[PDB]
């Protein structure tokens, strides 16, 4: 019983984090095989003006690099720039490289972040890529390069490299192919993200989790058609209802159809009247159906 | 920027989790040195009624154990009962044993739980020991023996071994010394926990984190003295304020004294009124001074 924000174990990933230093700039890198991945701004000559990375890369001198794994130095033999990432080729192959793949997150997908600060992991937490392509993380200077991952089918999927913090406090990263999520730039200039949207499928999953844990004071009998809910959502900051696949499975299991939950969302969006649901005082879109089913049924969708 | 409930890395602990099988039961154990620690009920043959652990231990046979690390079987050479825990001596030392110590959690302290099942870690999350000595975790059958830990000063402090789930869904564990938190028993009969209280010290830390970020719509100028606040707390389900000195760094950085936050607590307890603080719609007591200062300033 119970439902709590959880992170997948960090062991496999911790052994891949290294300290990358170029000149006076220090940040984190991910060492897989004989390549160390890190944000390209590690070579930026400044952090106050617009950066011309083409020029920056042309004047880059490899002897300025210092890469440390634990207490050992890695030997740099080359480096190439890909989008907002740098791929540094070293002589050493990380013997702890887990079976892995690289994937690009979709809107609303959940993953894990290993917050690192000098090539050393300090914390781990689960997060979701929001519809505005930013995440609600917690970072301080030095967190750049921190990796985002998911453990699946016996391997590690690398999906996020921390890059910047917007004026709003929201965080943005890039995939390992160098593509910044949301199209944000790795420049100091002011950048504003679009309005965030509540993830409807996650809210529905959260309500089903409440039902499975014996919390149903809010549950009523009225039903709301998906087509109609979607009209409301588009105008009230909520994403459209979709999936339904795993949802139909839960609807059958609990005997409570999705329509009843969509009606509840529409109502609960006005307030909980002082009551709580699984420890929360307002609708929560942090848990996906995947997390809910894994935590309560022990199965992976 | 930001404030997120985090867990400390699980790397050093994952390597110590083993599967402990005895008769018709399977749960998790913690392998440190040449000892495997686990809940003693793993030897309970029948759990339909009261368990006579002294009797259970007297009939226990070492050959009925099967301890597996990853894919390897460990040789059992002995086993003793300490409180609600079993200390199983094996024939080999865990080469991955980290620098460690054992500590017993006090009311309201935070730690990390590595949720394990068939002797394999599946999830990790930070949690706090509540005033009623239970934790609001997330587990399914097979999680018994999952360890709770804290990383500090270059070593791993083992503080919790998962033991039971109450009818309310609350979770209870024991220290590695074999003392069950809250005095709960590893018996089948119904057991009920006491009323929980909001951890004032954590709520204060939460408000400081709010200020450090751009959220201060709730901040007023009135000062509520500790003495007066504790009077209100005792009658409203909150713990008493303590260690005001500890908040020195946060108060100095924000320019806001604890007294003003105690006043805010008393007021915000009546409701936020549609507004949110760091994304929450009600007071939060999940973050300690330690967590906030670490996430805000990177200081331990």
UniProtKB/Swiss-Prot annotation, chain A:
Changing residue 171 to A: 67% loss of 3CL-PRO activity. Changing residue 171 to T: 93% loss of 3CL-PRO activity. Changing residue 162 to S: Complete loss of 3CL-PRO activity. The active site is at residues 41, 144. It comes from the Viruses. Changing residue 64 to G: No loss of 3CL-PRO activity. Changing residue 41 to G/S/T/Y: Complete loss of 3CL-PRO activity. Residues 1-301 form the Peptidase C30 domain. Responsible for the majority of cleavages as it cleaves the C-terminus of replicase polyprotein at 11 sites. Recognizes substrates containing the core sequence [ILMVF]-Q-|-[SGACN]. Inhibited by the substrate-analog Cbz-Val-Asn-Ser-Thr-Leu-Gln-CMK. Also contains an ADP-ribose-1''-phosphate (ADRP)-binding function. This is 3C-like proteinase. The chain holds residues 2966 to 3266 of 4085 of the full protein.
């Amino acid at each position: 019983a119970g439902l709590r924000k959880m992170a997948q174990p960090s062991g496999f990933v911790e052994k891949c984090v290294v300290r990358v230093c170029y000149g006076n700039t220090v940040l984190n890198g991910l060492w897989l095989g004989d390549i160390v991945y890190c944000p390209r701004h590690v070579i930026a000559s400044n952090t106050t003006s617009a950066i011309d990375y083409d020029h920056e890369y042309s004047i880059m001198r490899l002897h300025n690099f210092s890469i440390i794994s634990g207490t050992a130095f890695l030997g740099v033999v080359g480096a190439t720039m890909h989008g907002v990432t740098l791929k540094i080729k070293v002589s050493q192959t990380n013997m702890h490289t887990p079976r892995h793949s690289f994937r690009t997150l979709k809107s609303g997908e959940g993953f894990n972040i290993l917050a690192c600060y000098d090539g050393c992991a300090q914390g781990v937490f689960g997060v979701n890529m929001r519809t505005n392509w930013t995440i609600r993380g917690s970072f301080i200077n030095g967190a750049c390069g921190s990796p985002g991952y998911n453990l699946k089918n016996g391997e590690v999927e690398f999906v996020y490299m921390h890059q910047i913090e917007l004026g709003s406090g929201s965080h943005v990263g890039s995939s390992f192919d160098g593509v910044m999520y949301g199209g944000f730039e790795d420049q100091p200039n002011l950048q504003v993200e679009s309005a965030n949207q509540m993830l409807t499928v996650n809210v529905v999953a959260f309500l089903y989790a409440a039902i499975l844990n014996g919390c149903t004071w809010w549950l009523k009998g009225e039903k709301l058609f998906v087509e109609h809910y979607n009209e409301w959502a588009q105008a009230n900051g909520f994403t459209a209802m979709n999936g339904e696949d795993a949802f139909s499975i839960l609807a059958a299991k609990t005997g409570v159809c999705v329509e009843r939950l969509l009606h509840a969302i529409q109502v609960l969006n006005n307030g909980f009247g002082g009551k709580q649901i699984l420890g929360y005082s307002s609708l929560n879109d942090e848990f996906s159906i995947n997390e809910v089913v894994k935590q309560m049924f022990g199965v992976n969708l």
